[PDB]
Design a protein that fits this description.
binds protoporphyrin IX containing FE; oxidoreductase; Short UPO family; homodimer; binds magnesium ion; Molecular structure; dimeric; mainly alpha; globular; Fatty acid epoxidation
C-alpha cells in the first residue's frame, strides 16, 4: 500500500458521495473511484483491504446489501446508499433522519453529540460510543414521529460505531478505542488522518474482531426496540 | 439478434448446479447461462433473460441482486445457492416441497399435480387459475408445515413467479395473462423451452410495469390474508 499515491482530493460535482464516511473517504483517496460511480463489491473488498485492512467477510456481506440500493446490475454510485431502510437508518452519528432533514450529508450539529462524548479523554471508546448511540436514538424518538428502530437498525448502528473505533484506531483495533483527533477528521472531512499520525491497521479487521465490540456497545447502550420491531429491508429503489 | 438454434436443450447432469427456479434452470439447460450452473453474475442473468425470454433488465437486476445474497462470493452464485430458505426461496412453491418437510430444490411432480390440473376445461393457465393454485398451495403449507412462513413479501414473490411463467411461456402476447398448458408443463417438468411444441420468445418486452398489474390481479384473486408474522424480513446471507 503506497499511501502517497492515494492523496486526498475534495469531491466536485462529477463525484457521487453517500451517507457512509468509510466509503466516501476511500473515494476521496482514490482507493475507490474518485467519482464515486461504477462501484462493485469486488472494488469495495479491494479498497477496504488496501485503505483500512478490513477483510472480505464483512465487505462482501455489507457490499451485496448495498448493491440493492442502485438500479444497476453489479455497481452503485455512493449516493445511492442514502436509500432509506436498506442500510441507511435513523439515529445516525453525523446525518439527520430522512423524515426531518438531510440523511446524506455530514451535519456538524448532529455530530455534536459524538464530538462532545468521553469528555476529558483523548479517545472515543466502547462506553462513550454506547452513550452516543443512546443519546442519538433518544433524539430521533423525541423529534421524528416516523422513527424506525429495530434489532436490525440497532445492530447496523453498533456495526458502524465499531467500524470507526477499529479503522481509525492508534494501531491495535482489538482494543475498541480510537483517538478523537482521527475520528473527527474521518467524519468532518472524509479524509484519512495521515497528517495527524494515523496509519492503516497492521491487524486485519474481521467479523470476529468487530463482533464483540458491536455486542458490547449494544449491551451498554440501554437499548429497546420501537413499534413492530420488523427487520424488513428495502430491496430496491423506487 | 438471438439465435435459438445455437442454444439446444441438454438434460442437466447430476453434477450440474441447478436451483429452485425453473426460469434460470431452463436458461442453463439451453446454454444461455453456463450449463454447469456455476459462476453466474447479475449481468449474465440480465443478458440470458433478455435473449431467452425478452425479460428486461429492470426485473432481472432487482431479483438478481437479491439472489446474489445467497452465496458467500462477491458477485456470483451457483444456481443451487438460490435454495437458501427465506432469501427468495419460500414455502408454498408451485413445484417444490417446503424445506421444513421436504426437498425445497428439485421439481416434484406430486406437488405439481395442483398446477397441472388447474384451470379445468381450458388449454391455458391464466391469472384466475394461477391465483387459485397459489391459494391451494399456501393452504397446504398452512395445514402440513409446522414451520410455515407466509408474509406479504412471500405472497408478492409467489404472485411474481406466477406472473413470470404466464408471461414468458405465453403464445406470444404476454399482456394476455395466459400461457398454453402444453408450454408451461414442459417448462416446469423438463426446464426446457418448448420450441418443438411451437413456443417462441415474446416479441413484447417483459418489464416491471408490464408485470405489476398481473401480479396485483393474481394477489387479489388468491384471497390472500396475513396469518402470523407478516414482517417482510429476508435472510441477508448464508450462515
Ligand atoms: C469499509 C469500511 C467501512 C467503514 C469504516 C464504514 C463506516 C461507517 C460509519 C462510521 C457510518 C456511520 C455514519 C453515521 O452514523 O453518521 C457508516 C454509515 C453507512 N455505511 Fe459504512 N463503513 C464501511 C463500509 C460500508 C459498506 C461496504 C457499505 C455498503 C456497501 C456501507 C454503507 C453504509 C451506509 C448506507 C451508511 C449509512 C447508515 C446511517 O448512518 O444511516 N458502509 N459507515
Ligand atoms: C429469468 C426469468 C425468470 C423466470 C421466468 C422465473 C420463473 C420462476 C418461477 C415460475 C418460479 C416458481 C417455482 C415454483 O413455485 O415451484 C420461480 C422460483 C424462483 N426463482 Fe425464478 N424466474 C426467473 C428469474 C429469476 C431470478 C433472476 C432469480 C434470482 C436471481 C430467481 C430466483 C428464484 C428462486 C429463488 C425461486 C424459488 C422460489 C420458491 O419457489 O420457493 N428467478 N422462478
Ligand atoms: Mg441515517
Ligand atoms: Mg420454495
Amino acid at each position: 500500500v503506497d499511501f502517497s499515491a492515494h492523496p486526498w482530493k475534495a469531491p466536485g460535482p462529477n463525484d457521487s458521495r453517500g451517507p457512509c464516511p468509510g466509503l466516501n473517504t476511500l473515494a476521496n483517496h482514490g482507493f475507490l473511484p474518485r467519482n464515486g460511480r461504477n462501484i462493485s463489491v469486488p472494488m469495495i473488498v479491494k479498497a477496504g483491504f488496501e485503505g483500512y485492512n478490513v477483510q472480505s467477510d464483512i465487505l462482501i456481506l455489507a457490499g451485496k446489501i448495498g448493491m440493492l440500493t442502485s438500479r444497476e446490475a453489479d455497481t452503485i454510485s455512493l449516493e445511492d446508499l442514502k436509500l432509506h431502510g436498506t442500510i441507511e437508518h435513523d439515529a445516525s452519528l453525523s446525518r439527520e433522519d430522512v423524515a426531518i432533514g438531510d440523511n446524506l450529508h455530514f451535519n456538524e450539529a448532529i455530530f455534536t453529540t459524538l464530538a462532545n462524548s468521553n469528555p476529558g479523554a483523548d479517545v472515543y471508546n466502547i462506553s462513550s460510543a454506547a452513550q452516543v448511540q443512546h443519546d442519538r436514538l433518544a433524539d430521533s424518538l423525541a423529534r421524528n414521529p416516523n422513527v424506525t428502530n429495530t434489532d436490525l437498525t440497532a445492530t447496523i448502528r453498533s456495526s458502524e460505531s465499531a467500524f470507526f473505533l477499529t479503522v481509525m484506531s492508534a494501531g491495535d483495533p482489538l482494543r475498541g478505542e480510537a483517538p478523537k483527533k482521527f475520528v473527527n477528521v474521518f467524519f468532518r472531512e472524509e479524509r484519512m488522518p495521515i497528517k495527524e499520525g494515523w496509519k492503516r491497521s497492521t491487524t486485519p479487521i474481521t467479523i470476529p474482531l468487530l463482533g464483540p465490540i458491536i455486542e458490547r456497545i449494544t449491551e451498554l447502550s440501554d437499548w429497546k426496540p420501537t413499534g413492530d420491531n420488523c427487520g424488513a429491508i428495502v430491496l430496491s429503489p423506487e
